[PDB]
Scaffold this motif. Structure first.
Motif, PDB file in Angstrom:
ATOM      1  N   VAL A 149       0.809  -1.227   0.000  1.00 19.45           N
ATOM      2  CA  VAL A 149       0.000   0.000   0.000  1.00 19.45           C
ATOM      3  C   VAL A 149       0.847   1.285   0.000  1.00 19.45           C
ATOM      4  CG1 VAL A 149      -2.132  -1.040   0.947  1.00 19.45           C
ATOM      5  CG2 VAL A 149      -0.415  -0.107   2.535  1.00 19.45           C
ATOM      6  N   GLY A 150       2.050   1.232   0.578  1.00 18.66           N
ATOM      7  CA  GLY A 150       3.014   2.340   0.492  1.00 18.66           C
ATOM      8  C   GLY A 150       3.122   3.205   1.739  1.00 18.66           C
ATOM      9  N   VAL A 151       4.258   3.898   1.919  1.00 17.17           N
ATOM     10  CA  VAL A 151       4.441   4.765   3.116  1.00 17.17           C
ATOM     11  C   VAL A 151       3.426   5.873   3.263  1.00 17.17           C
ATOM     12  CG1 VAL A 151       6.769   4.841   4.148  1.00 17.17           C
ATOM     13  CG2 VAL A 151       6.397   5.903   1.873  1.00 17.17           C
ATOM     14  N   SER A 152       2.863   6.352   2.158  1.00 20.51           N
ATOM     15  CA  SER A 152       1.906   7.445   2.257  1.00 20.51           C
ATOM     16  C   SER A 152       0.732   7.033   3.137  1.00 20.51           C
ATOM     17  CB  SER A 152       1.415   7.892   0.881  1.00 20.51           C
ATOM     18  OG  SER A 152       0.986   6.778   0.127  1.00 20.51           O
ATOM     19  N   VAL A 153       0.389   5.750   3.100  1.00 18.08           N
ATOM     20  CA  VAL A 153      -0.656   5.164   3.963  1.00 18.08           C
ATOM     21  C   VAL A 153      -0.205   5.167   5.447  1.00 18.08           C
ATOM     22  CG1 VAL A 153      -1.864   2.964   4.525  1.00 18.08           C
ATOM     23  CG2 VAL A 153      -1.749   3.766   2.125  1.00 18.08           C
ATOM     24  N   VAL A 154       1.022   4.736   5.700  1.00 13.90           N
ATOM     25  CA  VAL A 154       1.579   4.808   7.056  1.00 13.90           C
ATOM     26  C   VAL A 154       1.562   6.245   7.588  1.00 13.90           C
ATOM     27  CG1 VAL A 154       3.551   4.239   8.526  1.00 13.90           C
ATOM     28  CG2 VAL A 154       2.907   2.753   6.554  1.00 13.90           C
ATOM     29  N   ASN A 155       2.025   7.178   6.764  1.00 18.71           N
ATOM     30  CA  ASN A 155       1.983   8.605   7.086  1.00 18.71           C
ATOM     31  C   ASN A 155       0.563   9.099   7.446  1.00 18.71           C
ATOM     32  OD1 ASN A 155       3.157  11.115   7.477  1.00 18.71           O
ATOM     33  ND2 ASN A 155       3.503  11.540   5.295  1.00 18.71           N
ATOM     34  N   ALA A 156      -0.403   8.764   6.600  1.00 20.32           N
ATOM     35  CA  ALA A 156      -1.794   9.171   6.817  1.00 20.32           C
ATOM     36  C   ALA A 156      -2.321   8.691   8.174  1.00 20.32           C
ATOM     37  CB  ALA A 156      -2.692   8.650   5.659  1.00 20.32           C
ATOM     38  N   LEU A 157      -1.926   7.485   8.568  1.00 25.70           N
ATOM     39  CA  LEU A 157      -2.386   6.900   9.819  1.00 25.70           C
ATOM     40  C   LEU A 157      -1.405   7.082  10.981  1.00 25.70           C
ATOM     41  CD1 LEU A 157      -3.856   3.765   8.030  1.00 25.70           C
ATOM     42  CD2 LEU A 157      -5.000   5.954   8.666  1.00 25.70           C
ATOM     43  N   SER A 158      -0.450   8.003  10.819  1.00 25.49           N
ATOM     44  CA  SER A 158       0.478   8.334  11.894  1.00 25.49           C
ATOM     45  C   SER A 158       0.152   9.690  12.498  1.00 25.49           C
ATOM     46  CB  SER A 158       1.915   8.315  11.390  1.00 25.49           C
ATOM     47  OG  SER A 158       2.363   6.986  11.259  1.00 25.49           O
ATOM     48  N   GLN A 159      -0.034   9.716  13.817  1.00 26.48           N
ATOM     49  CA  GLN A 159      -0.193  10.960  14.582  1.00 26.48           C
ATOM     50  C   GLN A 159       0.987  11.888  14.273  1.00 26.48           C
ATOM     51  OE1 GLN A 159      -0.570  12.016  19.406  1.00 26.48           O
ATOM     52  NE2 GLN A 159       0.588  10.201  18.765  1.00 26.48           N
ATOM     53  N   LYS A 160       2.184  11.300  14.191  1.00 27.56           N
ATOM     54  CA  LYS A 160       3.387  12.027  13.792  1.00 27.56           C
ATOM     55  C   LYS A 160       4.305  11.071  13.040  1.00 27.56           C
ATOM     56  CE  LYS A 160       7.271  14.452  16.027  1.00 27.56           C
ATOM     57  NZ  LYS A 160       7.851  14.774  17.367  1.00 27.56           N
ATOM     58  N   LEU A 161       4.967  11.571  12.016  1.00 28.21           N
ATOM     59  CA  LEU A 161       5.966  10.772  11.333  1.00 28.21           C
ATOM     60  C   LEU A 161       7.172  11.657  11.046  1.00 28.21           C
ATOM     61  CD1 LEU A 161       5.555   8.151   8.384  1.00 28.21           C
ATOM     62  CD2 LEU A 161       7.094  10.143   8.225  1.00 28.21           C
ATOM     63  N   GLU A 162       8.354  11.119  11.296  1.00 30.08           N
ATOM     64  CA  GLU A 162       9.592  11.869  11.087  1.00 30.08           C
ATOM     65  C   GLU A 162      10.424  11.168  10.032  1.00 30.08           C
ATOM     66  OE1 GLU A 162      12.178  11.390  14.319  1.00 30.08           O
ATOM     67  OE2 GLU A 162      13.510  13.052  13.826  1.00 30.08           O
ATOM     68  N   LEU A 163      10.866  11.928   9.059  1.00 30.38           N
ATOM     69  CA  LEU A 163      11.677  11.380   7.987  1.00 30.38           C
ATOM     70  C   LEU A 163      13.038  12.038   8.111  1.00 30.38           C
ATOM     71  CD1 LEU A 163      12.257  10.126   5.188  1.00 30.38           C
ATOM     72  CD2 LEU A 163      11.081  12.133   4.184  1.00 30.38           C
ATOM     73  N   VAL A 164      14.093  11.238   8.200  1.00 31.46           N
ATOM     74  CA  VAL A 164      15.433  11.806   8.157  1.00 31.46           C
ATOM     75  C   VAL A 164      16.251  11.099   7.088  1.00 31.46           C
ATOM     76  CG1 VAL A 164      17.562  12.293   9.450  1.00 31.46           C
ATOM     77  CG2 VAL A 164      15.339  12.550  10.573  1.00 31.46           C
ATOM     78  N   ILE A 165      16.861  11.897   6.208  1.00 31.26           N
ATOM     79  CA  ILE A 165      17.592  11.394   5.058  1.00 31.26           C
ATOM     80  C   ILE A 165      19.030  11.894   5.129  1.00 31.26           C
ATOM     81  CG2 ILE A 165      17.793  11.488   2.502  1.00 31.26           C
ATOM     82  CD1 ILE A 165      14.628  12.285   2.612  1.00 31.26           C
ATOM     83  N   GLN A 166      19.975  10.977   4.980  1.00 29.16           N
ATOM     84  CA  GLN A 166      21.394  11.316   4.831  1.00 29.16           C
ATOM     85  C   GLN A 166      21.741  11.054   3.372  1.00 29.16           C
ATOM     86  OE1 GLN A 166      23.630  10.064   8.710  1.00 29.16           O
ATOM     87  NE2 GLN A 166      22.226   8.436   8.143  1.00 29.16           N
ATOM     88  N   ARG A 167      22.153  12.106   2.670  1.00 29.64           N
ATOM     89  CA  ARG A 167      22.299  12.081   1.214  1.00 29.64           C
ATOM     90  C   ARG A 167      23.088  13.297   0.772  1.00 29.64           C
ATOM     91  NH1 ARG A 167      20.345   9.773  -3.256  1.00 29.64           N
ATOM     92  NH2 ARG A 167      19.952  11.162  -5.042  1.00 29.64           N
ATOM     93  N   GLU A 168      24.068  13.076  -0.099  1.00 25.51           N
ATOM     94  CA  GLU A 168      24.862  14.166  -0.665  1.00 25.51           C
ATOM     95  C   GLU A 168      25.563  15.091   0.362  1.00 25.51           C
ATOM     96  OE1 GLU A 168      22.288  15.707  -3.752  1.00 25.51           O
ATOM     97  OE2 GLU A 168      22.474  13.847  -4.900  1.00 25.51           O
TER      98      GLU A 168
END
Ligand SMILES: CCNC(=O)Nc1cc2c(-c3ccncc3)ccc(Nc3cccnc3)c2cn1
Length: 191
Positions: free
Chosen positions: A90-109
């Motif tokens: 179903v994808g992370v967007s679904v997890v996000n929608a059903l999360s009170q809070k979601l934190e994304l941290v990316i290490q890149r470049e």
């Protein structure tokens, strides 16, 4: 406008997307969905290790050492690639929608990038929060207490069982499980 429509529809009928919200099965599917995307990054040959951590604040995080979710911005739109991935159905967007809070941290470049969401709504643009030579992606979410009932806390055994399978169904992938609540830990990997 189109995004807030899709995220409302997930929020409206969560059982459709994530599974039963009243017995823990959907709750734990939230974690496997995030893990599935780290697995894909490993299968592309870019990620060697996935770490799933149960924290003491009713959140779980999933980390990988892959390429990092892309951070680029559409010049005329402003909206970052990371944001599109986290919000569009179903994808992370679904997890996000059903999360009170979601934190994304990316290490890149050479940079650490961070964005926070509440019920899938970005609270601010993706922003630089440091520098690094590592690469990878960390997603941490607190499940909505409006969506999930009866079982609202993550259970180690359920996670351990499915993470083990995931490691033998995509062999060569190292998956660690850590529970900060009691210090329990496991390493799943198969050759
Ligand atoms: C802890 C969770 N890890 C994770 O999502 N890893 C990840 C995902 C990438 C995705 C992605 C994410 C969610 N849904 C669908 C796809 C897309 C692109 C990536 N990286 C990438 C691919 C191609 C070129 N540049 C970067 C990802 C890297 N790690």
């Amino acid at each position: 406008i189109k995004v807030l429509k899709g995220l409302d529809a997930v929020r409206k009928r969560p059982g459709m997307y994530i599974g039963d919200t009243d017995d823990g099965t959907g709750l734990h599917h939230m974690v496997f969905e995030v893990v599935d995307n780290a697995i894909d990054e490993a299968l592309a040959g870019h990620c060697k290790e996935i770490i799933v951590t149960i924290h003491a604040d009713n959140s779980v995080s999933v980390q990988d050492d892959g390429r990092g979710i892309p951070t680029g911005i559409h010049p005329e739109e402003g909206v970052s690639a990371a944001e599109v991935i986290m919000t569009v159905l179903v994808g992370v967007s679904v997890v996000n929608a059903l999360s009170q809070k979601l934190e994304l941290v990316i290490q890149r470049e050479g940079k650490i990038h961070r964005q926070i969401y509440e019920h899938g709504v970005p609270q601010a643009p993706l922003a630089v929060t440091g520098e690094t030579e590592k690469t990878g992606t960390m997603v941490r979410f607190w499940p909505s207490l409006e969506t999930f009932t009866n079982v609202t806390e993550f259970e180690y055994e359920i996670l351990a069982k499915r993470l083990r399978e995931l490691s033998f169904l995509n062999s060569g992938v190292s998956i660690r499980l850590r529970d900060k609540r009691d210090g329990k830990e496991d390493h799943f990997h198969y050759e």
